[PDB]
Amino acid sequence: PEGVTAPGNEPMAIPSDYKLVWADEFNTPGAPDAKKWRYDTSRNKEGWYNNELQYYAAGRPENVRVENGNLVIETRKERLTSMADYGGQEYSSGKLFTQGLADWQYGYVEVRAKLACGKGMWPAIWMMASDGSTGWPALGSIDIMEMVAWDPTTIHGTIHTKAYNHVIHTQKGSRTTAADPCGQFHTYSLDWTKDRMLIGVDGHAYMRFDNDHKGNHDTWPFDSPQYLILNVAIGGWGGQQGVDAAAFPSKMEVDYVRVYQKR
Numbered sequence: 001p002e003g004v005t006a007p008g009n010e011p012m013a014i015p016s017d018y019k020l021v022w023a024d025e026f027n028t029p030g031a032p033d034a035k036k037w038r039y040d041t042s043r044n045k046e047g048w049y050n051n052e053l054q055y056y057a058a059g060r061p062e063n064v065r066v067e068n069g070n071l072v073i074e075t076r077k078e079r080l081t082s083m084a085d086y087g088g089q090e091y092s093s094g095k096l097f098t099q100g101l102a103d104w105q106y107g108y109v110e111v112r113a114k115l116a117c118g119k120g121m122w123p124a125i126w127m128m129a130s131d132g133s134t135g136w137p138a139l140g141s142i143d144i145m146e147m148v149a150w151d152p153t154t155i156h157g158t159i160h161t162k163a164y165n166h167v168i169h170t171q172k173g174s175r176t177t178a179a180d181p182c183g184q185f186h187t188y189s190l191d192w193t194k195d196r197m198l199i200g201v202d203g204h205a206y207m208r209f210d211n212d213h214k215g216n217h218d219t220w221p222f223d224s225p226q227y228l229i230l231n232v233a234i235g236g237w238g239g240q241q242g243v244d245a246a247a248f249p250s251k252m253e254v255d256y257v258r259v260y261q262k263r
């Protein structure tokens with residue numbers, strides 16, 4: 001298959017000698033836990049990357065709230081023109097991350113989620129290196145789950161490095177089919193060790209990316225902590241077959257995040 005550059009085909013499970021080090025169960029309705037999550041508003045004025053169309057609203061229950069035991073990130077077609085950091089965007093959405101609060105070097109990450117559909121929507125569950133000194137894409141980024149809702153049953157798992165990234169079409173990725181990802185929950189899983197990453201759905205790794213063992217940061221920048229990111233972008237990749245006005249509002253629901261690490 002054309003762009004499968006990091007194929008996987010093996011089971012994944014929480015190793016027996018790993019412990020739970022961090023979780024959000026999202027069982028307390030209201031605002032996300034401020035000891036666990038912060039809002040990224042860093043590019044609201046300038047505009048987000050990837051020709052994205054959304055404004056990411058902080059402190060707005062209409063975009064980001066915990067209810068019925070899930071985190072909800074909801075896209076809306078509206079101009080939040082009263083925000084000081086407004087960048088002319090036609091849509092609102094949310095982006096949460098654990099940056100500065102919680103980060104991990106190696107481990108087993110599980111995110112149970114139901115995804116946001118409608119042509120335009122680009123839900124993501126991903127990580128970035130806590131030390132961004134080398135910039136993107138050198139620092140290393142981990143896409144545990146991306147979906148673009150013009151192809152809503154296709155789940156993409158991808159890593160980006162300096163040598164291996166989407167700007168030069170060398171990203172290391174795979175994809176699999178999941179049943180109705182916007183109408184039912186699935187478990188999106190990362191098993192990250194010093195020697196390889198597995199990315200999967202419901203216990204099956206469809207992606208594997210190996211440490212080449214050359215000690216080259218350009219091919220393996222993953223020996224340092226990564227923080228977790230939950231977002232629903234609009235346009236860019238999500239807009240390849242257009243943005244449908246009728247598709248707003250749309251939500252991604254996250255039942256839980258669980259992170260495990262070797263004891």
Ligand SMILES: OC[C@H]1O[C@@H](O[C@@H]2[C@@H](O)[C@@H](O)O[C@H](CO)[C@H]2O)[C@H](O)[C@@H](O)[C@@H]1O
Pocket residue numbers: 049050122123124126136141142143146160166233
């Ligand atoms: O903001 C850091 C970096 O993000 C890129 O896009 C990422 C993509 O590389 C991958 O990691 O998936 C996530 C979630 O779908 C995208 O936001 C941008 O291409 C880049 O310009 C930016 O520096």
Ligand SMILES: OC[C@H]1O[C@H](O)[C@H](O)[C@@H](O)[C@@H]1O
Pocket residue numbers: 050143146156157158166171173236237
């Ligand atoms: O356009 C950016 C997207 O491009 C790709 O095809 C990658 O798999 C994905 O991780 C990235 O976010």
Ligand SMILES: [Ca+2]
Pocket residue numbers: 025026027069070254255256
């Ligand atoms: Ca829950």
